[model samples]
Target: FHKIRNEDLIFNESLGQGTFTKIFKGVRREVGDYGQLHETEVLLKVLDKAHRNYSESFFEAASMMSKLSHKHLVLNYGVCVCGDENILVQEFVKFGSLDTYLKKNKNCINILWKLEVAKQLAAAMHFLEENTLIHGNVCAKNILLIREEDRKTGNPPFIKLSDPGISITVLPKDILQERIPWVPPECIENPKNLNLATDKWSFGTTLWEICSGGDKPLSALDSQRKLQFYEDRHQLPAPKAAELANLINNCMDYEPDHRPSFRAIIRDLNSL
Candidate 1:
């Protein structure tokens, strides 16, 4: 973490706009231990905390973000604490969330539902596992879609994942009554810090979201109080001999042991 001088940070154009928080492109003079960080343009996320709630471990979560890195993971410089709220200096990704992209280019981009999206995400997830890091929040909202520069005048560019959060991946003792239908059964049965297996479960959910163009098709059951036990036998569709469908089912195994590791998923994706 570095000391952020209010004078150095010059907020430029808005990258994203939200009711809770906003992401803006900023220019800054290099400050703190890493001088190279601020030399380039960085993303500044201004969060609102006036009427906001936070965990005591929230600071710890933001601080620990230094450990995150990968081709697909967004690089976070550090957090800037200003009053009760905070600012995150993250690497600027050209394209935003998969949610908006998918919605906008629905007709233009067809066949995105194919396993290519899963393969890219699997590569990112594999990198996370190699670094002993957890995605914590592996959802459509968190995953970013970015297109790289190329020499071709006009061609279909490749996409990738980014913006893996370091927030509370660990579950609380009490019931979290939020409408999270993607949470794995193992996590629900025994509350604990999310592991590789748990992440795979969420990965399956993310694939479902991608396949449905942002809608959670698998979450047919509404989480009233807690998850229903019968969801284990959800009878999720494993379409006509497609590896993606099979892989999705495997990742969402009722038991952690049954879920495939990131390494296995990576290898299988390569094979496919």
Candidate 2:
């Protein structure tokens, strides 16, 4: 593990805070040749002051991420441990998450870019599957964006998917409750376990969000009873593009076994 000093973490700004950790918009100070502070924009997620038992899983995920390389996966810089506090340093995705981006710029983006993002997600998922790892939490919120801002065009079509961010077991129950919508029916019923099938289910909703201007997975419902109700009749609102809509439908397949595999999703996306 690359242990960075807490002193090097500078330009602190809070991005967001969850029950387990608080994320900060910051830059890691260094003397090496990486360029300036703007180029070094990073999101530092610091664990809550009292959550000391998460040491193992936190480092385990960091070690796992060090070996994970993909264009579409958000890159982590390193880690910083200061006394009782645990901190994670990662690339600061400028345009925020796909969920937040869509909400802000729903009507101004290009259609082709949206399709490309779907394919990118497929590729990332395929890579994870190949490595025997499941991105157990797959949703729009975790999909980071890299904005190639040109005044001539107002859009950030490029994307990168962030990791699950923390161990699910260590997270507070309230946060877990909020994540239920993107979770698969099988996994929802059995919250203790998940697999490739469960991930496919999440990819389905993610596709829906991409196709629907970043719509929430289930905007009108919550709770297991209603969530299960929606899952039984779950179908993504089709996008205007027929071929792409068909791809979205297959991904949201009601049966876990029926959903297209990541390889299959990639093939179909390529065809489109």
Candidate 3:
């Protein structure tokens, strides 16, 4: 067994929290004395293997992460099984997640940031679609932005996509009763047979959230009321941006086959 050292770990407490696990800012100690000063920052997602649900989720997350690689996708550095716990070490995104940012900013509507995020999201989804993988959940909460300094042009910021905890190979069961309102109707009505088309629906909802300045669909009502509103109205308010509005409408189409592919989305966004 390898000896644990104090210098090997650095923890940041104020970042975030999770239900099935505890996330900590960590650093992996370098191999030699010189390398010790250059530790890499990583987000350590520690799971209690004793919990059945945690173990299942951890395994699923690890397996899915190991197979995916894209510029916009978060990278899983490595995994460490220590005693009865499973820990996932991934690249730490400094800017946190889209949800926290939206909550803090309160609909500031950063157009450039939104566009960058959309592009990254599209790229990541395209990569997964090409691999025949589907991200069962694609919401603002799961997308992460990583800022960087551009050396030549000295750009202020950049973004990347993160978190694939809810990806699934087979279609999931209909859980519309438990789904968030922003999820498209098709997803709520028939979750069991999801495909690339369903992902488009989710993507459209996320885009709506971005353009709508973080306003969720039917946010004015409670869960039950929201469901009632959706069933009765059949549509939400139009997005502020015309491009985004049209995209959401296309994605939320009743027929799954009618939804555009990620490839098509990439082309559309690039043209805009």
Candidate 4:
């Protein structure tokens, strides 16, 4: 059983709140691959037991998450289902969210590091694309930062895109309003048809955020209509690097079909 014992987990401070879960920084005491007892840092996504179909839905998500293994994707340790609470145990990245990291290191971050972030994220997306998985949300906020100390071997801080394949496409009206900037025109007109192309658009917005040092896409721009106007006209503030600007342009294409596949994105970024 890939089940973690409830008592073996020590919950710490709240990391944040999610859709219908309370996230906690936690420690999981368990047997490692070496068959020795070990304690490791993890994040617990505790689901509301009272919610309808909570157990069934989370179990389904847990199954999918367990199967995903990638260097650039967050690792899901397992799930803890006991008492009245069900928890999704996940790897805790020391640096936390990419957006927050970028904003905090605005003056310290360099172009090369920013490029590494883009390349790694593109690699992760390419992996999902190859596996026919759809990541509905592809924003910097959802991407985790992994520093050298956080990983086994890596000279620089890298990225691990999180919450992959977890459907957050259907949010409340208020949240949807706030998320419009990331949603492509096609999704705005018809959200039911979310596909890989939709993620490409979101990736473009995310790339722009990185290029602009973690600022929100069109942060100064107000209203959905104006945002759409800028996007529709292909006038989103361009990144300084011509190559990055071109990639973002391709990703944010008005016609979803015209957007490059993640495979192509990886190849293009690799060239830079």
Q: Rate the local accuracy (lDDT) of all candidates.
A: 0.62, 0.73, 0.66, 0.76
What's the TM-score of every candidate structure? 0.75, 0.85, 0.78, 0.85
lDDT by residue for model 3 over 1-272, one digit each (tens)? 13334446566664555435677888776565654456778787776444435565555755675677777777776666645656667788887777666666754546665666687788888888898876667777677768733536746445565554533332233335334554555555555566777778778878877776666666566667756655774655687665667777777666779989888888878877
Candidates 1 and 4 compared by lDDT, better number: 4
Where does candidate 3 clash, by residue pair?
none
- Root-mean-square deviation of Cα positions for candidate 3 versus the true structure, in angstroms: 4.2
lDDT value, candidate 2, whole model: 0.73
Task: List candidate 1 stretches off by more than 4 Å.
Answer: 10-41, 50-56, 62-65, 110-114, 148-179, 218-221, 229-232, 235-243
lDDT of 1 by residue, 71-110 (tens): 6666676667755657777666677777666666655544
Sort the predicted structures by TM-score, highest score first. 4, 2, 3, 1
Quote the lDDT for 268 in model 4.
Answer: 83
Error of 2 at 137 (Å): 1.4
Residue 242 in candidate 4, Cα distance off native in Å: 6.3
lDDT of 2 by residue, 41-99 (tens): 77887877777677676666656656888888888888888678788888898878887
lDDT of 3: 0.66
What C-alpha lDDT, on a 0 to 100 scale, does residue 72 get in candidate 2? 81
| Candidate 4 lDDT by residue in tens digits, 181-244 | 6777776666676888888888988898888777887665566664467456755768654448
Model 3 poorest ten-residue lDDT run: 166-175
Question: Which one is best on lDDT?
Answer: 4
